[PDB]
RNA sequence: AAGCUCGUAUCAGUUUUAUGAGAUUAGAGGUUCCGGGGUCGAAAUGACCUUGACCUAUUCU
RNA sequence: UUGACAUUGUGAAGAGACAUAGAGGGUGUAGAAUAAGUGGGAGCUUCGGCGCCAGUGAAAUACCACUACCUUUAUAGUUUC
RNA sequence: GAAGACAUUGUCAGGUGGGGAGUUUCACAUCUGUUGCAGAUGUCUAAGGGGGGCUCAUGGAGAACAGAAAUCUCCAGUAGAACAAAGGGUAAAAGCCCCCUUGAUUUUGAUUUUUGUGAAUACAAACCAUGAAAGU
């Protein structure tokens, strides 16, 4: 209350560390407690975020989840007290999802791991390049709760990554969501999750498919029209030469006419 | 001052008869025992018919 | 103002009091002001600048660029002067840490993250195409402005307040507020 | 009700004349790589086993 | 019912704070070691102990500046209890 | 005897006080809660001008891989197409493509919708775009 009893906090963080070592489940009482104290603002310190990092890097599922939900809660200020976020994300993606393919986590937990990885990556300009092929298995409309997965796909995109590994993603989505015969919600979800990719990685889809997607402006369904207008207004301010003359809306065209001579 | 509905609503977080007792939902239930009644003017003629006595022939398609 | 001139004059005289440590003392400006909280993302970034960093740059390039910049007095590299380096993290980190900055051709800023990916992006010296003062987490911010030119100090100060005590310093000299 | 500009001819509960205005795949099989059971597997993205959902050919407009 | 003022005078001893002047500090792991952090860089040298070049580490140590926190030393006075 | 600068007493200021008084009775849709909700994010809230060229939807016949749908050629086709889902209007266009521009510009008054504006409407002077031009 008055002043932070460092002699006490530093002592009762050591027991959390020495609980998380015991690999059965006993770090539950460290994670559940450190989350409470962070929420009450009593343990705002660099020493504590390491505990939840180690929990996220643990083998027990209910401890890993406590760590992941701590670092989630859009993320919290604890990211700004990490020691190496890039190596953290690399170790997570290597241990849990891809490395051994132990298949311990269910889909509801895999999605929460994906959310954390993508939201760290987009925020801190990280580079892993395995993410973008791991998503492709799950990017199918016949898959369980894909609107969460594709909303994290965009969150791992940058201005500073090779756009080919995102081109393959966009061409998977385009092949499987805005193809022939697909439904209105499916096509609208595809276009909406592509334009919010291109808002971070603009040169990740080329003009030839950009035009194929702005085809769907006057689509009579009111989902695909609202979606295509967003892509058009996105590339009207960024790369309006990829768009055709029909779409450059009275100022992009005037800016191009003066700057083309 | 602490015993005021204003202060109660402030410290906690509309219908006639909401107190420390008897929230919204409860007042409506307890009004059922009374106001299945028939409204009239001063000379005497129906303004608002009683509940479940509207007396209008609908379009039954 | 010319209250900068009296400061810089006997800084240049301190130039000739403890003369030489057999190098050249660069000039620096340290910014101190209050009223902002960087733990919230109040971020700033601006690169509208022009020095003498004992220029040590490493350009990656092609045949068209390596024999362009063999002149110039510059360290240069092939693409497979980089391809045959990924096997050793501390090796690819030592070159990371060697040079003050990095540049590369317009072709190789698609391939450089596959090779020098984790490094060279958090370090804040990622290359830039050819043919900074980031408010990351702290209130403290120092920038190297020049060498042993009073104009440059004000030139940078107006830009910093443009973006938003002031101190000027040399390698071992004192502080002048 | 009290009046005041003046006493034209304009008016009219009327007429005349012209003229406009959804559910069905049983029958075949492929997948779920998040649902995995089965003899087996130090070890295995298997022989096959079913729950399935999936892509299908049907019917009305 | 609890607080302030007044009635309300004569004495004493203690604790806390304003306000200045100071003084020092940092173990998750690895690393010689207990790394706030940031920025300049490869000696002022009593020693050339050393700083650079050498690991290990997100971050590298001399030398000199910046501006964050933490803990303590003294009472011109200031007051409160 | 006790007690003592406290209690008390006086004035202010918070709290309690039905004991008592007076009185009333614009949008599809991933992201947090109540139940299948009101709320929070982000996401739509929209290219007009004047010149030229050309006809659309659909069907039939026909061509290696090529099939009901990939590209090509011919015939029919008053609109069955498109123009922000059974409706009016539009076919050398009011539609698609192409060329040039950005009159979606200022000043002076007039009319309808409407006393308040805005909206649309025509009207003249200038700067302008367009086409060879009429003219817009």
Curated annotation (Swiss-Prot), chain A:
Subcellular location: Nucleus, Nucleolus
Additional remark text: Present with 3640 molecules/cell in log phase SD medium.
Quaternary state and interactors: Associated with the 60S pre-ribosomal particles. Interacts with NAP1.
Function as written in the Swiss-Prot or TrEMBL entry: Required for 60S pre-ribosomal subunits export to the cytoplasm. May also be required for 60S ribosomal subunit maturation and accumulation. Involved in G1 events and passage through start, and possibly actin cytoskeleton organization.
Protein family per UniProt: Belongs to the SDA1 family.
Descriptive protein name: Protein SDA1
Gene: SDA1
Residues of the full protein shown: 193 to 515 of 767
UniProtKB/Swiss-Prot annotation, chain B:
Signal peptide: none
Residues recorded as bearing Phosphoserine in the entry: 51
Compartment(s): Nucleus, Nucleolus
Region (Disordered), start-end ranges: 1-13
Function comment: GTPase that associates with pre-60S ribosomal subunits in the nucleolus and is required for their nuclear export and maturation.
Misc: Present with 67700 molecules/cell in log phase SD medium.
Protein name per Swiss-Prot or TrEMBL: Nucleolar GTP-binding protein 2
Organism, scientific name: Saccharomyces cerevisiae (strain ATCC 204508 / S288c)
UniProtKB/Swiss-Prot annotation, chain C:
InterPro entries (UniProt xref): eL8/uL1-like (IPR050257), Ribosomal_uL1 (IPR002143), Ribosomal_uL1-like (IPR023674), Ribosomal_uL1/biogenesis (IPR028364), Ribosomal_uL1_3-a/b-sand (IPR016095), Ribosomal_uL1_CS (IPR023673)
Superkingdom of the organism of origin: Eukaryota
Modified residues (Phosphoserine): 71, 78
Modification after translation, per record: N-terminally acetylated by acetyltransferase NatA.
GO terms for biological process, alphabetical: cytoplasmic translation; ribosomal large subunit export from nucleus
Protein family membership: Belongs to the universal ribosomal protein uL1 family.
PANTHER family registered for this protein in UniProt: RIBOSOMAL PROTEIN L7AE FAMILY MEMBER
Protein name: Large ribosomal subunit protein uL1A
Native source organism of the sequence: Saccharomyces cerevisiae (strain ATCC 204508 / S288c)
Lineage start: Eukaryota, Fungi, Dikarya, Ascomycota, Saccharomycotina
């Amino acid at each position: 209350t008055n002043g932070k009893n460092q002699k006490l906090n530093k002592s009762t963080q050591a027991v959390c560390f020495n609980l998380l070592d015991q690999p059965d489940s006993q770090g539950i009482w460290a994670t559940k407690l450190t989350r409470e104290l962070w929420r009450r603002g009593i343990w705002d310190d660099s020493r504590t975020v390491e505990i939840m990092t180690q929990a996220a890097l643990h083998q027990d599922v209910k401890i890993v989840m406590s760590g992941v939900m701590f670092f989630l809660d859009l993320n919290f200020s604890a990211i700004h007290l990490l020691r190496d976020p890039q190596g953290f994300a690399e170790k997570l993606f290597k241990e849990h999802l891809s490395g051994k393919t132990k298949n311990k986590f269910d889909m509801e937990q895999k999605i929460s791991l994906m959310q954390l990885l993508s939201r760290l990556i987009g925020t801190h300009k990280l580079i892993v390049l395995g993410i973008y092929t791991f998503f492709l298995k799950y990017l199918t409309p016949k898959q369980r709760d894909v609107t969460r997965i594709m909303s994290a796909c965009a969150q791992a995109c940058h201005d500073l990554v090779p756009p080919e590994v995102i081109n393959v993603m966009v061409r998977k989505i385009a092949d499987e969501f805005v193809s022939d015969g697909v439904a209105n919600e499916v096509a609208a979800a595809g276009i909406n999750t592509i334009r919010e990719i291109c808002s971070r990685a603009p040169l990740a889809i080329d003009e030839i498919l950009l035009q194929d997607l702005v085809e769907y402006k006057g689509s009579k369904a009111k989902g695909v029209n609202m979606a295509a207008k967003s892509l058009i207004a996105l590339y009207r301010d960024v790369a309006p030469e990829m768009l055709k003359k029909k779409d450059r809306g009275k100022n992009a065209a005037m800016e191009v006419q003066e700057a083309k001579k | 001052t602490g015993k005021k509905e204003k202060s109660r609503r402030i410290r906690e977080g509309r219908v006639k008869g909401e107190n420390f007792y008897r929230d919204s939902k409860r007042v409506k239930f307890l009004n059922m025992y009374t106001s299945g009644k028939e409204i009239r003017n001063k000379k005497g003629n129906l303004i608002r018919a009683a509940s479940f006595q509207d007396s209008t022939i609908p379009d039954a398609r | 103002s010319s209250q900068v001139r009296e400061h810089v004059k006997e800084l240049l005289k301190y130039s000739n009091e403890t003369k030489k440590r057999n190098f050249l003392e660069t000039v620096e400006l340290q910014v101190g002001l209050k009223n902002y909280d960087p733990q919230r993302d109040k971020r700033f970034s601006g690169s509208l600048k022009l020095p003498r960093p004992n220029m040590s740059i490493c350009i990656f390039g092609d045949a068209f660029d390596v024999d362009r910049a063999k002149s110039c007095g510059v360290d240069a590299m092939s693409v497979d002067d980089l391809k045959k380096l990924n096997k050793n993290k501390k090796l690819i980190k030592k070159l990371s840490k060697k040079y003050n900055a990095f540049i590369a051709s317009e072709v190789l800023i698609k391939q450089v993250p596959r090779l020098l990916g984790p490094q060279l992006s958090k370090a804040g010296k990622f290359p830039t195409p050819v043919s900074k003062f980031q408010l990351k987490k702290v209130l403290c911010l120092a920038v190297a402005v020049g060498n042993v030119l009073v104009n440059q100090i004000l030139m940078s100060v107006n830009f910093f307040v443009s973006l938003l005590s002031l101190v000027v310093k040399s390698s071992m000299g004192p502080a002048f507020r």
